[PDB]
PDB file of C-alpha atoms and ligand atoms in Angstrom:
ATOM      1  CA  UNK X 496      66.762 -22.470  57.627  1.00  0.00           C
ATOM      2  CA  UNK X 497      63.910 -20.155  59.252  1.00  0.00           C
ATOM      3  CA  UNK X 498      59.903 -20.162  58.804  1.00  0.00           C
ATOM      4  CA  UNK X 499      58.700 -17.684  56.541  1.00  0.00           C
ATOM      5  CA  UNK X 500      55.987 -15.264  56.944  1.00  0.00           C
ATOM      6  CA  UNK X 501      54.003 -13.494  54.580  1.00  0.00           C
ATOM      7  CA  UNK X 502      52.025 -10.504  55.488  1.00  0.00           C
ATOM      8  CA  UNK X 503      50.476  -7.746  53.626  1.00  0.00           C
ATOM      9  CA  UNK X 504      47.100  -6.158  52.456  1.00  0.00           C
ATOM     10  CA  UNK X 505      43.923  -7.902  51.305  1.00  0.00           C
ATOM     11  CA  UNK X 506      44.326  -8.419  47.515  1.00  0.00           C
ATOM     12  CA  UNK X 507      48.141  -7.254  47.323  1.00  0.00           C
ATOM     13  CA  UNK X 508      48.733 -10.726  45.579  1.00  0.00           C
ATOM     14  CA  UNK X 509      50.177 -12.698  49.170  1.00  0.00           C
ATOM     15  CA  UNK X 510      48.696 -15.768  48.044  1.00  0.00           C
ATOM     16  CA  UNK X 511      49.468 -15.876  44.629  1.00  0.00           C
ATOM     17  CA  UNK X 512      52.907 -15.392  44.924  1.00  0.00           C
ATOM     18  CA  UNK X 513      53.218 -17.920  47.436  1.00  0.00           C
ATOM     19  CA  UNK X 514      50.953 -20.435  45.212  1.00  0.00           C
ATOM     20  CA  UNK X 515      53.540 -20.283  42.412  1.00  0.00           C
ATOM     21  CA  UNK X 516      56.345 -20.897  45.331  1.00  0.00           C
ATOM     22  CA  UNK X 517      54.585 -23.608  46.665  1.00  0.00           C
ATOM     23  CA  UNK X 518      54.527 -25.514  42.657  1.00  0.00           C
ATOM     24  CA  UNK X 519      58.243 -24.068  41.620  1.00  0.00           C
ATOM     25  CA  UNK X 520      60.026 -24.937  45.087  1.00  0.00           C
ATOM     26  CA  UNK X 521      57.225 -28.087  46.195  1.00  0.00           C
ATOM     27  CA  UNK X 522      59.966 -29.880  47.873  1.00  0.00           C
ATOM     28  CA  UNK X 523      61.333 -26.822  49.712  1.00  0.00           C
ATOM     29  CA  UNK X 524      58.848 -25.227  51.055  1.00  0.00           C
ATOM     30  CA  UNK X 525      55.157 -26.327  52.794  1.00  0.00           C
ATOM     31  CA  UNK X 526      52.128 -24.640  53.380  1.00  0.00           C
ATOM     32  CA  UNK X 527      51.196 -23.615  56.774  1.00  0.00           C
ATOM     33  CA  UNK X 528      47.410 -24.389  56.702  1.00  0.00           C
ATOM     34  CA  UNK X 529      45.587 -22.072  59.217  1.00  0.00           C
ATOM     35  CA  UNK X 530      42.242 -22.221  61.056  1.00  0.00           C
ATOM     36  CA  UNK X 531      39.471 -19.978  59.917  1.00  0.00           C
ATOM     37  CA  UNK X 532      35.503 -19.579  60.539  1.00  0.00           C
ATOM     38  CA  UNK X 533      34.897 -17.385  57.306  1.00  0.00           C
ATOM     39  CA  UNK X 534      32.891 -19.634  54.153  1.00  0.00           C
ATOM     40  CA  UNK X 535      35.140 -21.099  51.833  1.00  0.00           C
ATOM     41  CA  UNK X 536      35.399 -19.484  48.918  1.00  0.00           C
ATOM     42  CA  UNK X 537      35.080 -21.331  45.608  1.00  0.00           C
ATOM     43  CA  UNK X 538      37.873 -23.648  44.590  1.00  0.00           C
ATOM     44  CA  UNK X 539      39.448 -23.374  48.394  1.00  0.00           C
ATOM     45  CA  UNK X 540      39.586 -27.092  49.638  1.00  0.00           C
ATOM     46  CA  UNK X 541      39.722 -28.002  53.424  1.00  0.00           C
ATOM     47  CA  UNK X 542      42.897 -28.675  54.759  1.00  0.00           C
ATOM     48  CA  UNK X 543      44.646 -27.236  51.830  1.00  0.00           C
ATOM     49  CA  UNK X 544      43.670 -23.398  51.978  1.00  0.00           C
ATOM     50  CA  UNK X 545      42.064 -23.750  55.452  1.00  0.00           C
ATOM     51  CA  UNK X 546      40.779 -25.526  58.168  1.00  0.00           C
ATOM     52  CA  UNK X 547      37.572 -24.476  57.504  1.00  0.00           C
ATOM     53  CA  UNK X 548      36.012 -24.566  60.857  1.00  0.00           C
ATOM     54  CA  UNK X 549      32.595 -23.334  62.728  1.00  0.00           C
ATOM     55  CA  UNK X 550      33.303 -20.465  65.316  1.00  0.00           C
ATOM     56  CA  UNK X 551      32.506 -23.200  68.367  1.00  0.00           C
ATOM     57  CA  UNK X 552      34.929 -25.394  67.006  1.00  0.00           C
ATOM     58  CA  UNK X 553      37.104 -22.945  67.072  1.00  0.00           C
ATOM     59  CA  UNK X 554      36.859 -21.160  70.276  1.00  0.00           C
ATOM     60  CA  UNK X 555      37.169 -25.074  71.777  1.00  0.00           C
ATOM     61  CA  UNK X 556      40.558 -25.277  69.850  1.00  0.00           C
ATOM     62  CA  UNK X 557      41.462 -22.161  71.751  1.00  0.00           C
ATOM     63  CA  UNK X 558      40.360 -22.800  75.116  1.00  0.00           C
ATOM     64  CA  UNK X 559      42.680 -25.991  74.138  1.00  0.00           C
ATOM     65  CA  UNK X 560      45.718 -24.327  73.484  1.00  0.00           C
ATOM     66  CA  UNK X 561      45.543 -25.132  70.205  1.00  0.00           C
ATOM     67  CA  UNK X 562      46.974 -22.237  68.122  1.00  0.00           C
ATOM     68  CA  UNK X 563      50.321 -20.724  68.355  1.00  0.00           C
ATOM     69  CA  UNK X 564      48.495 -17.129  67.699  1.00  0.00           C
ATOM     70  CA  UNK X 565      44.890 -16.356  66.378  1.00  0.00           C
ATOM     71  CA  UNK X 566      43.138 -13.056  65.654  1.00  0.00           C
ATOM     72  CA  UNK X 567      39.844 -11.669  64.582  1.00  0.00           C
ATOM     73  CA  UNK X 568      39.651 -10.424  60.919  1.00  0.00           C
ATOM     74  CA  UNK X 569      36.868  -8.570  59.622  1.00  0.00           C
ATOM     75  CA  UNK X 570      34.049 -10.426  61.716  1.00  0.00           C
ATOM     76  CA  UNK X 571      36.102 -13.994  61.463  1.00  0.00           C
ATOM     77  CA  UNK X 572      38.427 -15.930  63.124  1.00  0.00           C
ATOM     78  CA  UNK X 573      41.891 -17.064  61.805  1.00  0.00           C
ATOM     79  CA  UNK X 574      44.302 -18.748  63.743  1.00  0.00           C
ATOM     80  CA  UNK X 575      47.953 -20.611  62.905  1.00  0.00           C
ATOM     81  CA  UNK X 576      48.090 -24.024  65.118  1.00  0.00           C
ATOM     82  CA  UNK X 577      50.651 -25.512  66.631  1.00  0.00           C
ATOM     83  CA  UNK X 578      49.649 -28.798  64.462  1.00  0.00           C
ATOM     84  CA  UNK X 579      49.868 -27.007  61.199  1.00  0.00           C
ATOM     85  CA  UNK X 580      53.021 -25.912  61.658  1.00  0.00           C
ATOM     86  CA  UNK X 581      54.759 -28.976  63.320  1.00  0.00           C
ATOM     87  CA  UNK X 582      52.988 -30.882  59.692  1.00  0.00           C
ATOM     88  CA  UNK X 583      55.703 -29.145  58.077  1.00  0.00           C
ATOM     89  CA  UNK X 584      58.570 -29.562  60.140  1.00  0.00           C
ATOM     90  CA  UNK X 585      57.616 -34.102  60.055  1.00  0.00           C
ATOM     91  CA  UNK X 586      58.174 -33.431  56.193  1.00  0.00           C
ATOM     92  CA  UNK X 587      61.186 -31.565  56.481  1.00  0.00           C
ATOM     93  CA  UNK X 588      60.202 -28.282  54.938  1.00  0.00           C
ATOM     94  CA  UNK X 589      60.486 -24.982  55.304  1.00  0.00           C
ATOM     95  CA  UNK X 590      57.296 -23.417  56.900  1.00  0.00           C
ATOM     96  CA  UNK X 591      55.323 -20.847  55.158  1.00  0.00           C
ATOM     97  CA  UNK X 592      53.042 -18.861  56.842  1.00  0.00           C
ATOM     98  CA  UNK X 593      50.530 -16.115  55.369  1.00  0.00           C
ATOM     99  CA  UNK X 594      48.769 -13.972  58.431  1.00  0.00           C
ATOM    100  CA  UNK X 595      47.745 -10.257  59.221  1.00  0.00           C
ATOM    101  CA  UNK X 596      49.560  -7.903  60.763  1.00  0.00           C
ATOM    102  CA  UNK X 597      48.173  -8.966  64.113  1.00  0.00           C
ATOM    103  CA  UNK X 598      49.821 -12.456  63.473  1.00  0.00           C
ATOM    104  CA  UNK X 599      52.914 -10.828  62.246  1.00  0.00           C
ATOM    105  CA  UNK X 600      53.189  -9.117  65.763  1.00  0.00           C
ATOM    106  CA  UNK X 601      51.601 -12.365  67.926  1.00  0.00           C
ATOM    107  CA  UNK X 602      54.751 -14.282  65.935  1.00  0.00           C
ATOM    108  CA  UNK X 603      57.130 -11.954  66.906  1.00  0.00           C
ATOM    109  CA  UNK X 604      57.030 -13.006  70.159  1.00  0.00           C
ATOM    110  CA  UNK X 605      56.574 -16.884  70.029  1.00  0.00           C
ATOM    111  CA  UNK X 606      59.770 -18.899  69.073  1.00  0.00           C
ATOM    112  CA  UNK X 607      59.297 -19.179  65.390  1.00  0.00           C
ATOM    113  CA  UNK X 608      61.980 -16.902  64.656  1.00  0.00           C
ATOM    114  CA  UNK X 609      60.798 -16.456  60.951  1.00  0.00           C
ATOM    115  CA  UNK X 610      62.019 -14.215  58.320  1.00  0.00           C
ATOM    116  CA  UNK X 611      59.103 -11.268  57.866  1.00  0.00           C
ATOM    117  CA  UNK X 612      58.189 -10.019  54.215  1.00  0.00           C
ATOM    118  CA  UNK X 613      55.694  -7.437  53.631  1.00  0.00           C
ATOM    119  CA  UNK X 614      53.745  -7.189  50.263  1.00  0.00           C
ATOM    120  CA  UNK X 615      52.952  -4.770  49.090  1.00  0.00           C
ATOM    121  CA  UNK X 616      50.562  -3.052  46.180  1.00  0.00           C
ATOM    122  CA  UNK X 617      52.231  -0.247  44.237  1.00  0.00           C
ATOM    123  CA  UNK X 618      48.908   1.583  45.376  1.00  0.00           C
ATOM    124  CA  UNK X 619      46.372   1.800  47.615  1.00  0.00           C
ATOM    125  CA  UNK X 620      43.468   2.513  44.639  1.00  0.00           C
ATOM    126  CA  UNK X 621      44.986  -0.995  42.853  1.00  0.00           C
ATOM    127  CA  UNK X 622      44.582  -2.601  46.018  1.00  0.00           C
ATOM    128  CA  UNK X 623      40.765  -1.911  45.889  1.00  0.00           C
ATOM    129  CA  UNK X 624      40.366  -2.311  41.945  1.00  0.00           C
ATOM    130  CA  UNK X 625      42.264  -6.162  42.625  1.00  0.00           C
ATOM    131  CA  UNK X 626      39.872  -6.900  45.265  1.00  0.00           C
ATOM    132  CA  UNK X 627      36.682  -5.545  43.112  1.00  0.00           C
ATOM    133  CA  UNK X 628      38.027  -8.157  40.643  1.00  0.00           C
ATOM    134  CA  UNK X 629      38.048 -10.703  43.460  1.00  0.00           C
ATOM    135  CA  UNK X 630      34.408  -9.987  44.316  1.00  0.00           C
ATOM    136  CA  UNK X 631      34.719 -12.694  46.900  1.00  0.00           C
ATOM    137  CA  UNK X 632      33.523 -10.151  49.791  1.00  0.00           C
ATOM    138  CA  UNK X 633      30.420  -7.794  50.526  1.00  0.00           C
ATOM    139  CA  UNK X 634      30.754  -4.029  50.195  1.00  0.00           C
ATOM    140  CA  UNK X 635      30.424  -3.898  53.642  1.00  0.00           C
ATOM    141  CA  UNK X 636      32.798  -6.823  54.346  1.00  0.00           C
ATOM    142  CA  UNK X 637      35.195  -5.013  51.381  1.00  0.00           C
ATOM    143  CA  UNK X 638      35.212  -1.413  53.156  1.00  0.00           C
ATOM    144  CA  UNK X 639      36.346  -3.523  56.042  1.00  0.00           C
ATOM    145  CA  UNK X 640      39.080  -4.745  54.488  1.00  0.00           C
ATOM    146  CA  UNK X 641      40.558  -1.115  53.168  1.00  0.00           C
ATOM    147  CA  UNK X 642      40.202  -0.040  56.654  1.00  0.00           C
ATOM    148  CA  UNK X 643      42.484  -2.581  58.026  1.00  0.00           C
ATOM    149  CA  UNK X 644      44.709  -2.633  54.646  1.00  0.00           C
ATOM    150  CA  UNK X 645      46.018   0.996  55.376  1.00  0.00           C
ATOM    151  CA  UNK X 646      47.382   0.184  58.606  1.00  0.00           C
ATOM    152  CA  UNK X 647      49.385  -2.591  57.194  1.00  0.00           C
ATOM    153  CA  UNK X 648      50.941  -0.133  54.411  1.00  0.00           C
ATOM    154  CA  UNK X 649      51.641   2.492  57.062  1.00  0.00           C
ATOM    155  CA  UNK X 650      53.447  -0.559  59.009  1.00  0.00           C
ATOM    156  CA  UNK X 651      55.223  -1.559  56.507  1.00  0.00           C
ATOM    157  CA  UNK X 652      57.711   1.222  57.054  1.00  0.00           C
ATOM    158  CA  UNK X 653      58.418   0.507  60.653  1.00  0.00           C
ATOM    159  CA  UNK X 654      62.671   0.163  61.330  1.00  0.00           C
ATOM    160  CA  UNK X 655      62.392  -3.462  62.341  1.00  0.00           C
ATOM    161  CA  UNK X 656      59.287  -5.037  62.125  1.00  0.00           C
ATOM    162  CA  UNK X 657      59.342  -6.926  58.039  1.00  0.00           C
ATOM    163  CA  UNK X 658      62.985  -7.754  56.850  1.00  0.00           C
ATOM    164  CA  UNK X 659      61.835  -7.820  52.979  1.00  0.00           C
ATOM    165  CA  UNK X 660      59.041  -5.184  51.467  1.00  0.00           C
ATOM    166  CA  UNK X 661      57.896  -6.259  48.182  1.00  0.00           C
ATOM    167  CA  UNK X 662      56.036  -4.215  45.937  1.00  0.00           C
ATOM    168  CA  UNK X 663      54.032  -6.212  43.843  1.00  0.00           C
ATOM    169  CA  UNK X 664      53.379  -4.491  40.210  1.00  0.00           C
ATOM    170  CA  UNK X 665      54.343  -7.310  37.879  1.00  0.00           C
ATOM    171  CA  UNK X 666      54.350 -11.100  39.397  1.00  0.00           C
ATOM    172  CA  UNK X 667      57.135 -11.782  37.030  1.00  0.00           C
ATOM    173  CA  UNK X 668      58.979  -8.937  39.404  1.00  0.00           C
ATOM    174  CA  UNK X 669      57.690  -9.933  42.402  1.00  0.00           C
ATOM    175  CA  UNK X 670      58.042 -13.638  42.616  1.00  0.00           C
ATOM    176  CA  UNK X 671      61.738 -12.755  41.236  1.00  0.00           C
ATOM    177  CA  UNK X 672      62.328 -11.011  44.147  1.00  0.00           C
ATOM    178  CA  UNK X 673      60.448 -13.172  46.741  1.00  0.00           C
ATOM    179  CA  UNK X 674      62.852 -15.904  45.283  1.00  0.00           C
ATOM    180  CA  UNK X 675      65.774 -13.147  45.626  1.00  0.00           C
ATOM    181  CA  UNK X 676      64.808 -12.636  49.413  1.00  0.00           C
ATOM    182  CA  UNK X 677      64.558 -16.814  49.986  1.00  0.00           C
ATOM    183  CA  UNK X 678      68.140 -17.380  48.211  1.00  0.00           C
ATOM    184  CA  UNK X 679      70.275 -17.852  51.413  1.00  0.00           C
ATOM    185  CA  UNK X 680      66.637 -19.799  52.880  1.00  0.00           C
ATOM    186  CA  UNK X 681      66.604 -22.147  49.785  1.00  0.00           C
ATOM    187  CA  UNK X 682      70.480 -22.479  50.301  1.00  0.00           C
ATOM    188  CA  UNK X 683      70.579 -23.880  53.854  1.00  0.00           C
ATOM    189  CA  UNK X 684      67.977 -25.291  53.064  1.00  0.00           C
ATOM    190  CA  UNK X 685      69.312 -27.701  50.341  1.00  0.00           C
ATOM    191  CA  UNK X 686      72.209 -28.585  52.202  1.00  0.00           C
TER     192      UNK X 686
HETATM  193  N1  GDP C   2      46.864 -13.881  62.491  1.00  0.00           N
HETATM  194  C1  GDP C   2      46.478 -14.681  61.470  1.00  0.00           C
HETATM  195  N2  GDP C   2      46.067 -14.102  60.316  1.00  0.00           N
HETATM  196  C2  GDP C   2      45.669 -14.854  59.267  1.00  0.00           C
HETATM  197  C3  GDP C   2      45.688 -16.316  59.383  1.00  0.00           C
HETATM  198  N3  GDP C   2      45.250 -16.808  58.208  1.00  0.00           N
HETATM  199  C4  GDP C   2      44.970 -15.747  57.407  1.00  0.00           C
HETATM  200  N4  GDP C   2      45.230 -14.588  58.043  1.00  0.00           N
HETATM  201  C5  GDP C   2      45.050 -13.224  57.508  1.00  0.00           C
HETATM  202  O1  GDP C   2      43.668 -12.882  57.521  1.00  0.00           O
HETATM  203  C6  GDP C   2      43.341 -12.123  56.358  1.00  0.00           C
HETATM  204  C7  GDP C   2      42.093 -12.726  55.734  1.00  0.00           C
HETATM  205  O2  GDP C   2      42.514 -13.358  54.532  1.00  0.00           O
HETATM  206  P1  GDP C   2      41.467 -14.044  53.527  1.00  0.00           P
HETATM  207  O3  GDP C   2      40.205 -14.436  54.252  1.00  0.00           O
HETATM  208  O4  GDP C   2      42.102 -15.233  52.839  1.00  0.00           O
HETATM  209  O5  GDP C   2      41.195 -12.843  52.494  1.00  0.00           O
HETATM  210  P2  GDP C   2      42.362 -12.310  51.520  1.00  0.00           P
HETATM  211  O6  GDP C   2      43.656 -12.173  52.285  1.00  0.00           O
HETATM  212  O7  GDP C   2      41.961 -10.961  50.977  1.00  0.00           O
HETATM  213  O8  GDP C   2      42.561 -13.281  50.379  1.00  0.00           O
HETATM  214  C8  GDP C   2      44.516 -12.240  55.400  1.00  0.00           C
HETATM  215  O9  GDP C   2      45.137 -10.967  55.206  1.00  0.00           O
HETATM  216  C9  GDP C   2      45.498 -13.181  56.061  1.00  0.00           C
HETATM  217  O10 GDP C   2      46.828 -12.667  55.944  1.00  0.00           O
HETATM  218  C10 GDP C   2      46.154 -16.871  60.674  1.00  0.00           C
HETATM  219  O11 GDP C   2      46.205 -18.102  60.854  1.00  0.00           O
HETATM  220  N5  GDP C   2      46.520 -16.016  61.641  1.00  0.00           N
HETATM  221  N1  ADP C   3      50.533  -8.330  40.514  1.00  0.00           N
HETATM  222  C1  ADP C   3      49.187  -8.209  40.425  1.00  0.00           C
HETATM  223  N2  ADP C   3      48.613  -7.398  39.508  1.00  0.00           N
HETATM  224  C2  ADP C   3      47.275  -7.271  39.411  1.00  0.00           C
HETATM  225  N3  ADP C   3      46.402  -7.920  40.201  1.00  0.00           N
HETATM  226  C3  ADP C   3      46.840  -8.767  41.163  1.00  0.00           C
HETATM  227  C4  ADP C   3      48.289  -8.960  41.334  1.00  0.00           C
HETATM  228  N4  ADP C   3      48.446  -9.834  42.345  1.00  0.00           N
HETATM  229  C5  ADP C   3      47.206 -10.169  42.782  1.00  0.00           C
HETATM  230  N5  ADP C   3      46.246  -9.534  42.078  1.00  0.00           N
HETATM  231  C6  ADP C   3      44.780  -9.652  42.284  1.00  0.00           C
HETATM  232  O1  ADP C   3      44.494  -9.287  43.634  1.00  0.00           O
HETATM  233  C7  ADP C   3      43.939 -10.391  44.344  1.00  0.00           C
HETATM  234  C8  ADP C   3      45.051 -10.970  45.198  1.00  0.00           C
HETATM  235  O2  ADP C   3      44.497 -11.766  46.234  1.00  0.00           O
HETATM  236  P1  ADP C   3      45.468 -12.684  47.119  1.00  0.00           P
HETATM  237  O3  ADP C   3      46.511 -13.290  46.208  1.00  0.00           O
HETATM  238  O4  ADP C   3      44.575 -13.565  47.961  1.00  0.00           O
HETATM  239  O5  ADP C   3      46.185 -11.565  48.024  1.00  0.00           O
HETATM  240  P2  ADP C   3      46.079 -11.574  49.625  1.00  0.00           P
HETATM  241  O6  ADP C   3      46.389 -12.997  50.031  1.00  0.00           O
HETATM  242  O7  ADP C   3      47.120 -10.558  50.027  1.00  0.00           O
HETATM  243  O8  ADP C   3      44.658 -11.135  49.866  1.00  0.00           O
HETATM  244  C9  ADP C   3      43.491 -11.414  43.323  1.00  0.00           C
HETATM  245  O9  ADP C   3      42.099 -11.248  43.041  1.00  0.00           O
HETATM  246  C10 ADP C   3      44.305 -11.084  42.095  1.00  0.00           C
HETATM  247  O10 ADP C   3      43.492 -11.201  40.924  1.00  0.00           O
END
């Protein structure tokens, strides 16, 4: 089977469809645990949600050659490492990855060869209201994230760029067909 990459908005519910994955399909699929310098947010645990690093730490891991891509997101770092990913592959799972659209584009070039799903909220106005709910960013770290959300909706349409969209209005729907887009994954990967 191939890696699997999740991209989409702030808020538009990437991690927690791929939470519920993670529990349903535990011995199918493993978490791709990237680098970031942002705080941890409550209930995040190092080296489950993130690396949680300081910004020297990881511009060293850079200058390294640490990270199969990395890219600045509203005033932090994030990063996917070669380590994280080669984790998964010693346990015999299929990697999961959840990055921007500027890892989206820095993996389309490395030899991952993932499958690409976008997802997506059925608006942009419910994609602030989830994050007002989420209240885990400043107003001016929140207007941020809008700015940089649109450009990921407008991308979302381009020919060959994602290989799933997912609009995500009801989880129920959604994870139903995130598991619908994984079938011939889960398939190869179970044999
Ligand atoms: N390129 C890249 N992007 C990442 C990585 N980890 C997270 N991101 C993206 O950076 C953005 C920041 O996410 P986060 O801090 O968790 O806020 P949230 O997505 O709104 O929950 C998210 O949209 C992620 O998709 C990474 O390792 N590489
Ligand atoms: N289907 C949905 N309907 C309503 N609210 C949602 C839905 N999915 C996610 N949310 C809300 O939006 C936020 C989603 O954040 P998260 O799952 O981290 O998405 P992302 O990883 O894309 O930022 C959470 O605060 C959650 O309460």
């Amino acid at each position: 089977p191939r890696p699997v990459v999740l991209s989409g908005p702030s808020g538009a519910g990437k991690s927690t469809l791929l939470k519920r994955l993670l529990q349903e399909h535990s011995g199918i699929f493993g978490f791709s645990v990237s680098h970031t310098t942002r705080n941890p947010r409550p209930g995040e645990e190092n080296g489950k949600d993130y690396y949680f690093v300081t910004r020297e730490v990881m511009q060293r891991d850079i200058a390294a050659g640490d990270f199969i891509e990395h890219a600045e997101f509203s005033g932090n770092l994030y990063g996917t490492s070669k380590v994280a990913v080669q984790a998964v592959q010693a346990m015999n799972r299929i990697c999961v990855l959840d990055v921007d659209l500027q890892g989206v584009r820095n993996i389309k070039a490395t030899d991952l060869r993932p499958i690409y799903i976008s997802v997506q909220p059925p608006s942009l106005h419910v994609l602030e209201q989830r994050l007002r709910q989420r209240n885990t960013e400043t107003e001016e770290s929140l207007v941020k994230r809008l700015a940089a959300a649109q450009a990921d909706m407008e991308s979302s349409k381009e020919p060959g760029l994602f290989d799933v969209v997912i609009i995500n209005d009801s989880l129920d729907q959604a994870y139903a067909e995130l598991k619908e887009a994984l079938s011939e994954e889960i398939k190869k990967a179970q044999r």
